[PDB]
Amino acid sequence: ADSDINIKTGTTDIGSNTTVKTGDLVTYDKENGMHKKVFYSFIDDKNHNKKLLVIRTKGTIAGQYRVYSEEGANKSGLAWPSAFKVQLQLPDNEVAQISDYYPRNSIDTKEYMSTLTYGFNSNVTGDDTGKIGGLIGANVSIGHTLRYVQPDFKTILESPTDKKVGWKVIFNNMVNQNWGPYDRDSWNPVYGNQLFMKTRNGSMKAADNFLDPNKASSLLSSGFSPDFATVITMDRKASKQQTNIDVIYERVRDDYQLHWTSTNWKGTNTKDKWTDRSSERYKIDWEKEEMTN
Amino acid sequence: ADSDINIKTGTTDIGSNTTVKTGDLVTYDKENGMHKKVFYSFIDDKNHNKKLLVIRTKGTIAGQYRVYSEEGANKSGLAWPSAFKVQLQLPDNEVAQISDYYPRNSIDTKEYMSTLTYGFNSNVTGDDTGKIGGLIGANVSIGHTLRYVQPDFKTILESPTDKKVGWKVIFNNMVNQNWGPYDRDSWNPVYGNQLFMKTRNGSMKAADNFLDPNKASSLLSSGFSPDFATVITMDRKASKQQTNIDVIYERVRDDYQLHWTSTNWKGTNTKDKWTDRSSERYKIDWEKEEMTN
Amino acid sequence: ADSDINIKTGTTDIGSNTTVKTGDLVTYDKENGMHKKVFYSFIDDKNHNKKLLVIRTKGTIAGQYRVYSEEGANKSGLAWPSAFKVQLQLPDNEVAQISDYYPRNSIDTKEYMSTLTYGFNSNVTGDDTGKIGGLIGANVSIGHTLRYVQPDFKTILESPTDKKVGWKVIFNNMVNQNWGPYDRDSWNPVYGNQLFMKTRNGSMKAADNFLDPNKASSLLSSGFSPDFATVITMDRKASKQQTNIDVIYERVRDDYQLHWTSTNWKGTNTKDKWTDRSSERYKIDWEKEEMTN
Amino acid sequence: ADSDINIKTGTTDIGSNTTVKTGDLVTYDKENGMHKKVFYSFIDDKNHNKKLLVIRTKGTIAGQYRVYSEEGANKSGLAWPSAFKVQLQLPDNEVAQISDYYPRNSIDTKEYMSTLTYGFNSNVTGDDTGKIGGLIGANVSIGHTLRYVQPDFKTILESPTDKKVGWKVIFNNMVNQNWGPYDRDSWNPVYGNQLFMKTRNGSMKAADNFLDPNKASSLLSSGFSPDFATVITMDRKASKQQTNIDVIYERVRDDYQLHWTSTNWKGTNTKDKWTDRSSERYKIDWEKEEMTN
Amino acid sequence: ADSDINIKTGTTDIGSNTTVKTGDLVTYDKENGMHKKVFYSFIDDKNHNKKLLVIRTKGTIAGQYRVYSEEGANKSGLAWPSAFKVQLQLPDNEVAQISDYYPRNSIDTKEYMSTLTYGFNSNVTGDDTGKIGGLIGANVSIGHTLRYVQPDFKTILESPTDKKVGWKVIFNNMVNQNWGPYDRDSWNPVYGNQLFMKTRNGSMKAADNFLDPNKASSLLSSGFSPDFATVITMDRKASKQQTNIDVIYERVRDDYQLHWTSTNWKGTNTKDKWTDRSSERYKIDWEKEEMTN
Amino acid sequence: ADSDINIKTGTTDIGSNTTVKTGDLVTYDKENGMHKKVFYSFIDDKNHNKKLLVIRTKGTIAGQYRVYSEEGANKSGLAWPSAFKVQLQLPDNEVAQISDYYPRNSIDTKEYMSTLTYGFNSNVTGDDTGKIGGLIGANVSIGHTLRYVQPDFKTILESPTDKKVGWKVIFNNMVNQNWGPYDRDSWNPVYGNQLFMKTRNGSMKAADNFLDPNKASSLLSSGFSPDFATVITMDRKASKQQTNIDVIYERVRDDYQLHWTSTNWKGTNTKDKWTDRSSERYKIDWEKEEMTN
């Protein structure tokens, strides 16, 4: 921060004695079930070398975790969201550039423990018959422990350019009724993938053997709410003061199939079975400091 | 935040040098036992591209955990709240849109631990008769630990649209006298569901064998207090400057039956037995910046 | 909060550029030993749709944990506070409404741990006579852990209406000289209830076998201090601008009896043996912004 | 707080655009060793319904932990402080009332853990002679854990009235050279009470067998510093604008006797052996906003 | 800090009543995949003895973790980033000096635990025949535990001069499917290096046996975002008021080869196989307080 | 605090719209090696009933841990600081009083844990000859755990009067190469006191067998820095506006002797062997708000 280099806090920050023009744009893609919300802020600081537009992508991409196939009482299929994506793209001919983004990729940590224990024990025994016994022993043990945090979904900033930026929230792993954690590549020779299996050998229809959405992560059914921010810089002496920007909301859906074998249920997971895409184009006028769709 | 993109804090936030019109609306549904309270705030920022109304749904939905049936001393029934819901809906013909909402769905995390231990031991024994013995051995152990936090009730934002938004607080699981935790699908071959069982094989009336409401979660008996916020945006150049909005308070009640078998009590739980709904319509005038019921 | 919906903090809060009229009302009920204190604040914000009165119930309800009966050296009785209540009630004919209250009911959480360990061991033995032995083995262990916090007293907001609000601080459980925790329903076949038993088989008078109040919770003897807040809203265009309000301080006392059996002490607990009630009526003038008793 | 009821922070607090008259009064009781300090603040807020006086009792009551009796090398006695008290009392004829106090009694909590583990093991053995053996077994274990914090001294607000308020800091328990913790009622059939016993069977004079004051709690020797606050309210329209107040500092001292039995030391503790009281009268003038002794 | 030396906070900090000239410079190296961003701030405080320029190197260096070689189904190679470097260099003839930098090197800590346990046990045994046995024994154990945090990547400030400064974020170690942690020098006699090996003895093509980039650290694939700050000081009385500065982004890539032996996969890691460099020259005018490329 | 009694923060604090006269006085006692520093602040608040002088005693008292005696290679002695004292004294005839001090004595706490575990196990054994065996058993265990923090040095406020105040920082205990902790009274029958013993049976001169000062606490060698604050109150109507104050810095040094027995080293500690005292007199002029030496 500034205080680490003997500079008063907020000295080198943009947005002092500057008028900021904010705005909201709301759309609902009903077929894709995506509530898209763009919150824009035009900043024109006279002490900054260009004009700034801060675009915040918000809203909610619905999860749509649901049983979609019922082939009798012995086989069923469930579609579930494995990834949510949000992308912002500038046309190649534009002179506006993407300058900053948030959140970024963080360095994950883990805790390591090492233990060395050694001990000695003695023992003397006997009985009423007069026999007396003895024993002396020693032991040594070495232990290692690894501890780290595993979120259900990870937010990753995809490698950005001056024209394109993107975020993806991907499924990492989940706990199924205190078991697991299970991921998309979990495999068991008997039960296959048990990511969303309710009972291992229950006697019911395959559509009734899926995990309750209430017991799973809330992002699977009720969806994910993006909270991403991008900064676009525009040269002041540019000839054209109009820009186009594309905002893409995406949902990748995997297919989890449950089938009844001779004695027990077996689960399989197919990755990236479906993709739901919702694009929207926006016009930015830097002179009027306005954004429309 | 703004400081992460080299922008002064609060620069891109609405509500600077603006007069805000606040108001309170209080209703009591005695039949459903719901104390409904709407706190509204009209914000007309000149630098924002439309008019904002912030509606905060508050109050208290009573739990109404109570014994409702008594079939002698051998069978009884208890009604208990399994879900509380709060929904805000706009008519389809309205031009006002739902733009933001709080709280949202968060990503839950868990902590993983892996342990590897290996050890060597050795002991020599003996007795007065001159017998001498020896023993040497080794051992290896691998362990895995999963740690996570489970609340009694989960707050979930249902997939919102531009016209509808909703929150549900649902029962997750509960600890019954240091046992459990038990949920709505807990099943024991002998006792069935022990969610609200007081004694396993007590000799008393079935109406006296339910868990004390003091020993259970306070949301079950005294109720839940919503604290939800919604933002509705209205275009300034819109012709009609009046809006209608519906606010729904809901309580889903499950039925827990206790019956005395030959030797011990047995509990069963039926889901969504009853639903208590309380609707209220509100008129919003954007010109007078006022809200009425 | 406001920052979560892109709104400057404190923008939608009441109490800007207005004058607040505060006051204090102190009473002491010597018979019930109740120090009642009402701190009121009249807020008339021109930007709010009605007049607000914030009433803070404070003071101290004494515990009065004391040995009250001495039937020789073999039987004794102790009165102890099991519940403290604070209630605010408006007459049904009043047009003023209770709008908000604090504290409310919170969702309690618990921490769950699951552990799976598997290990292999092997040892070889042998004496001096040439005998050689061998052993190889495996083991598997599964463990579950539940961790949560248990306060001595629970603070619960009883289901409020537009005319009535109430809080109760009830006894949950207590630790007796590092044993327990014991509650009002604790029962041992030999010693009965050991909530306040000092010694299990001590040879003294029954009045000297009760737990020292210093070693127990301070709320039992010295008492509990309420810190509750209520908000009452009054319409400005109302004809009558005078209100009456009742404030009730309550203390429920349980009776713990210690009796000497043939070889050991035995304790019993009777619930809600006594109730100490202290009512007070207050007049609120919204025109003078004043409160009296 | 105010923010919990949609009210700006500090809106309903006393002391806005008000002149506050502060003052200090310092006394030293040499025979009781008590440095008494009263810090008073007169607040006359025009928007408050009466005049406030905030009195802060501070200073230091010396501990005076010391060996006072030496009956040869076989018996000795030590006086140690078991309680410190601070009291503020108003005469019954006064019209000023005690309205608020700090600190108050808090609800103590504890952490509960429950663990259930089950495991299976199996091993096959053998020897060079051809004998082959086998063993298979199972085990189950249940555990409970209670964890809580124990301070050396507890601060308790005694039941206050409109004319009297008091605090007591009492001895709870102490650790003696990593043993214990020991309290005033700790009893051992061999050593009696080992609260301040240095060695169990040391060969020295009884006056040299007491715990070093440096190794014990600092409150025992150097003393305790009160930090208590009281608020006294006075009606503005009262005829007499002069008040008298008594401030009492107290120190209760227990007597710990060490006597040498045939083989080992034995300790006994007598409670409330001595009481040191230091009272002081103060005159409060509400017109001059002044306080003297 | 200042408060530690009795000085008001921020008293000795630069940037009081000073106008600050900020600016942004964005470049994209397509072949190296590096989004470079420089945020500069000119500070001319009249109370400071020279002119300050704060340069923040931001952006994103892409990871580019990818399988690049496929020699059939038995051999494959993967390029992965082992280091990210950011360097700022001033020509030797310049009179501007590098004065401060952030972040710096921090002192890492670890937690040490030592345990000593001793115990005694005794048991008596017998059978129906009348034989009575006895056993008594003792044991002592000593243990040591070391605990510390290991990040996946570590950020190190390389030894700076008055003309050059640099940071490197280097790969420390990673967890592979709850195993490890593995580093660049991890070696196993059977499997070699298992840093990115998916299955130990899977039957698949070598290009399909690499760890999923989603399961690994996000810096490996999506890349790293620098957040480094440098302060350059220029004398005001200097003749030439123009400076050149070189900013270099770097990515060192290691080569991880998987080959199928007779029965299992074997991994090898070659360090610093490739280096991707992206340099950019910038002109600083201290008179116009401007920066260009 | 003020907010706990419904009073705005800082309302009852001294130092509003008041000019404060600060000053520094630095002395170095070369023979005692004590850097004495007094930071004084005169406060004359018109709303306070007397004049305040805040004196902060700071600086550094050198530890002076050093080997001072060398009688051959068989025995040696080391002087080390066991206590650092800082005292402020007013002459008895002075009318100025000591009113407040910091830091004060705090109440130390400890964590108590209690565990109860019970379990059942059962195994069946056998062999090829047809022998079949069985075993069933139960176990119960009770455990207690005490946890607390032990600083190397304790800071204690000695019982102050209106004319004298003092602080002492005394040695509590120390860890010697992961052993201990050892205190001044530690005694082992073979090695005596091992506080600063480097090796138990090393073959070297006794002057080379002392613990490295780098491996011990930094206060022992480099010294302790006082940070104490005192407040002196002066009546405004006092005839004499001149005060004298004595400031004492003190260092108590213990003598640790290492002597070589027949087979091993033996350590002894003598308490309070030396006392280094450094007094300084200061004159306070309340009229001109000045302080000199």
Swiss-Prot record, chains A, B, C, D, E, F:
SUPFAM superfamilies: Leukocidin-like
Outcome of substituting residue 35 to L: No hemolytic activity, reduced oligomerization, not toxic in mice, no effect on ADAM10 binding
An annotated Gene Ontology molecular function: toxin activity
InterPro entries: Aerolysin/haemolysin_CS (IPR005831), Bi-component_toxin_staph (IPR003963), Leukocidin/Hemolysin_toxin (IPR016183), Leukocidin/porin_MspA_sf (IPR036435)
Documented effect of changing residue 259 to L: 46% of normal hemolytic activity, slowly toxic in mice
Pfam family, one: Leukocidin
Keyword hit for RNA-binding: no
GO cellular component, one term: extracellular region
Primary location: secreted
Record note on quaternary structure: Self-assembles to first form a non-lytic oligomeric intermediate, and then, a mushroom-shaped homoheptamer structure of 100 Angstroms in length and up to 100 Angstroms in diameter. Interacts with human ADAM10; this interaction is required for toxin pore formation, disruption of focal adhesions, and hly-mediated cytotoxicity.
Function as written in the Swiss-Prot or TrEMBL entry: Alpha-toxin binds to the membrane of eukaryotic cells (particularly red blood cells, RBC) forming pores, resulting in hemolysis, with the release of low-molecular weight molecules leading to eventual osmotic RBC lysis. Human RBCs bind much less alpha-toxin than do rabbit RBCs. Heptamer oligomerization and pore formation is required for lytic activity.
Protein name: Alpha-hemolysin
Originating organism: Staphylococcus aureus
